[PDB]
């Protein structure tokens, strides 16, 4: 039996704040740029489109210098952090951004075609954008967040898979690291192991993995390290409608319709999709910018910060405007203008700033704590006295380990919590 | 440490009220139209898309003529305002209004455009208009606001930059003066000196810099004079999305696609930039003439305006209907319609109205808080016994110095005031 | 030194309940139709776009008889009406309307256009019609509502203008007469003498003033009496987006563009304006039919009608839908259909109900109190021992002097009043 | 004076349920047709924007058996049946339905047409059809409701009308019968009588007339039987905007714009008209499935069912769908498609539930209290010792007569109505 950390873990009265200076990126929205081509040194892939997993590095409380170092006795019990309260800033203004493919497969418009429509002859691709589904999402978490996706089922030894033939879905699960793409709107899977074409979807996600917290899972989560706190909240609608080009997998049953003469005597392509498209972006349903407290989490760990490390996951695409830049050709920039004389580059900056309010706790070891402890994750007793179990997942870290201050009342998250307090 | 107000500055029970007249301003709502061509003396740039700034002037209290001048002793304290209420009035009724410009640069319709496109030949700008973001924002504070936007970053001696390349963004602080442009949704930065086409964006912000406030260093701001009072609304979505014409900086990498023949053969346009549209503008959701009272500011400043000074940063889109107006070129005005001979204007207006409930202070001068007002800012101690730091920004000037009053009963702010004070 | 009417008006408690009939009315929507050339007497230019200013004739309450003549003493006081609860109830069913031009100056859409456009040749003018932005609006005072628009300045005589120049705008004030049109979303100035080509907006303002409450000026005003009751809520967006034909006033500045070849080395007209709409129109957000009651005024008057008086002002677009009314030439009505045999009217009804519940007050004359309605309004007290200043203006005249009772359990807006009155 | 029933109506504890089985009926949506030409017996013009009046008809309270006939004494006073509950239950699922016309008169889109429009020559009608406005009523009395709509008023004597001229609009009042149709957003009018044309409007209101309630004269109406609860929501949006072919009757003011040459010398049609839309359907917004228990009525009628009837009108166009049936000419169905082997068939269909809870009431008779009944409705007196005033009129006769129950805790309406009751 797994056991709520109110049980064995003793709270204090001594609050500290603690917030990452401004976290900037800028680079590519739609892939990354190999280094110096043109100019020296990779440009990142950053889009709105993708999750945001910083790893925020807290300071160990017991080889730390307390406001008083008789709040606990070193010899029967521990110092754990616990976090009270976050705010996750937001930098740029709020706005809106189209993803497009050269070769968007894209048939035609079964929307309400004036009529019928070109022949299935060959590459009947075109140049499309779309503004994505709009999402915001926010987990944390003392272990990293987990997502799904679909993937292409492992080919059976006993029955295998004649080429062009659909493969078999399987639900993955695997950890959110910074950087993975979101649903945007065509569905949370693995678009460069089950779409060939390489032109179904957007260049931004074409070749990647879109994955979508797995919700469930870490809400079954027995010990809840996965998610203490989680905000979520998404809207989409369909835009345009639309025909895939290609010969059917799948045959349309001929019960389901009656033959004509002619193009109508077999059926075309029935493999439909819409384009996505969030609506208006407003403030009025922003997510962050705002403090929220977490006074009692929902798993068993109430926002106990084990190995003095946090993880912030986040999905904010309220926020997508990219930056066209275009510079010229010619030095003096001719009076006559030539679109071939100038080149046009997109870039996508993101802003983030992250502020906590942590509470310094205690754990006294006894036998069964230690027991419990140990049961759980045998490592935590080990750092009280190395190899992590992440150091192969990508993250955006964060040291805080030089940041932690006693004066609320000077920060701005500290003095909002201050008034929630009451004094 | 910084300190609160509260501890060093009494607040006494006397409020005055004060209020600008009717400020008021019209103009070309694209650009400036220089001396000359039928008009004599020069027609501002006014437009709604731009932060009005005012510098409110307030009376020295000290050198003031009090109800009552044994509320303080002027051998041990001195006075100052703190602002308490404010209201600021907005004239016109509310409308849209459309920004274009003459060669947009638009390649081709990439939302779902009936089929391919024409040819990356050479010059295909069309005229286009589109009506921005919408957005309203409001910040007090006695030190003008800071506001942020991306700018060509300062090419290095070490690797210069060929021309032609992308340089590197820079995010730049500078200070909102009354004049420049908000985000109107193409995002923050120097399209002057990022886009050398000129073509890129409307003429009202096409060689201009649409900053956005910096929400967060301000906050940040150890002092909080910068603001002590922050409302913002935005509210956006994608209208319709566009190719850029040009050629394309960073080329697509080979294995996000798969080539065709000819014309599909290598990738087309791939900078994807949507006309930006605030949707409906109802009085729902207006932000202004409406009083808010100021009890307690974010920041360590709770409103004191040192200085006697006040700064009023705002933005709002919510009303910008541009008036057209075409005059003949014959006198009679003949019956027979000629498009030439009617000459067509276009004209902005914008009308404000500033009020204010100001509550009257006392410092009594310490040592320790004469130390503390002089490490914080030297030249408070300095009027009490010149160079302006702000003298080389624009702001729309509004001098209150006659306009204090103490019968609040006499003006609405001012009974609005009464109301919530109880009485 | 301007005084609540609280101060030196007593409120007794008996309560009258008065009501119009049933006003209404029918016209023609777009303009009127000159008596008798069809048949007989003119027909009227009713809108739903017009302000509708009710001038509601009070009985005297001294001059009349009371439930018992000894509520006061008419040797030393005199008796007012005061307001305390409205119902303005609405007649027809909610409805849209257009509202267009047989020449609407509209030269091409620069919304998306496929392409390039026509040529700036002659008269490209089309027909075009557009629902105008929504509005409701209602006022109540003991005077004439204020409104806003903007005019033709007055040529100076030191600097003449030559024809074809811009004029200079002026802001002015004028009384809001009942059939005067609301800013419909394309501003509130005098398009009859702003706009030479009478083809720049819609026929039912094409030639007249649209003006705006001055909502600034009249919280401003001193006594109050302006308007001591207000209800606002408008709504609109941007449907198209087009431009205006005819030669460029301010010619386009050459730093804002790059010039290029044939039609492409002259900017075209970037004179923009969109055509509005009010979007959907629900019963959720309707301002009337609704009782509201007024406890304290929002100036010094607190709902008191001098000289008996009271001016509804109400502006209500929710109900606009034009009736089409055709009959044919031929008496049998032929069995054959044929356009020219058809006449085609187009008529707009409306129909208002005004309910009232008036409290009598009484004001005991004493020096000072005289002395003080003396400076406020002479008249006031001439009236109780002629020219009114109102007689050149347009009002729906609406006489209650017949229409007073006391058993307010005996109307609808009576119960209704008796129900928040406690019994 | 009319008095509150409350005065003269003593209310006992007594309360009964009462529900209609299950009305149901289909029929075609725009038109009757007439019998057995295909398939014996007429098909009824079921439509969902038509008005729904029940009839109800409850039981004798006098002439009944009672769970105790010592109540009341029959010698002194008589027993009414006083409304406390209702509940309109509905039947199908939400959906939206067309309207249309197969000569709709629409000149040209006067929205935005791409340049300049057909020829004004002869027979440019075109199929369309619209999505009507969405309305939701309902009103509970115990007579029937009033409606209102504009017809061609009567042809004066003294000065006759030419065939061809505009007739002269009144405003009639008339009684809201089972299977009139409402607004449905071309306004309320005699479209049979008014537009000659009989191609103005979608074929289910072309001929018809539509009727909206007159909900003004409604309340005014002195004793209240007409409506003692009422529920209304409308809404809707326009859609597209045209044109009406025809010659036009008010011939357009010259002094409102200015002359062209050509076609655009004269001008076109001026006679706009919007195809109405209502929006979303929700069932946010749903106004019936949800009992209304009416504790105090507007009119001084509380309830009380005189005559023991009772009249429920109802307007609810939110399942609208209509079933597209067909069926084909060929017994075999061939495997060959051709749309001639086909028929196709509209019907609509409308299922509705009736539940009330109804109080037992005694009225005691003394001298007053009969003259009073006897001024209200001599007949009411009479039946407590026939030619029914209605005989006229159509409505859905719903017999409750040996529906009532004692045991409201059987029935669902019934439980919910102890649960507000408190047991």
Known sequence: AVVNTDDYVTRTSIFYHAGSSRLLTVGDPYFRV???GGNKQDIPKVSAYQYRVFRVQLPDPNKFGLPDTSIYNPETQRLVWACAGVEIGRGQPLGVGLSGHPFYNKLDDTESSHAATSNVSED?????????????????????????????????????????????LELKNTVLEDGDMVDTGYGAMDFSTLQDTKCEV?????????????????????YGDSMFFC?????LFARHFWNRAGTMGDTVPQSLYIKGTGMRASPGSCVYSPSPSGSIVTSDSQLFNKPYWLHKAQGHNNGVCWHNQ????????????NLTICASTQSPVPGQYDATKFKQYSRHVEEYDLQFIFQLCTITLTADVMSYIQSMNSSILEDWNNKDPYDKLKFWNVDLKEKFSLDLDQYPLGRKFLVQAGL
């Open 310 to 321: 946090l993880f912030v996951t986040v999905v904010d695409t309220t926020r997508s405007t």
């Open 202 to 222: 957007p260049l931004d996600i074409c070749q990647s993995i879109c994955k979508y917290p797995d919700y469930l899972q870490m809400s079954a989560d027995p």
């Open 231 to 235: 905000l979520r909240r998404e809207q």
């Open 124 to 168: 009947v691709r075109d140049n499309v954008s779309v503004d994505y589904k709009q999402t915001q999402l926010c987990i944390l978490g003392c272990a990293p967040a987990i997502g799904e996706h679909w993937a292409k089922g492992t080919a059976s030894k006993s029955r295998p898979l004649s080429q062009g033939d659909c493969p078999p």
């Open 34 to 36: 190999p280094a110096g």
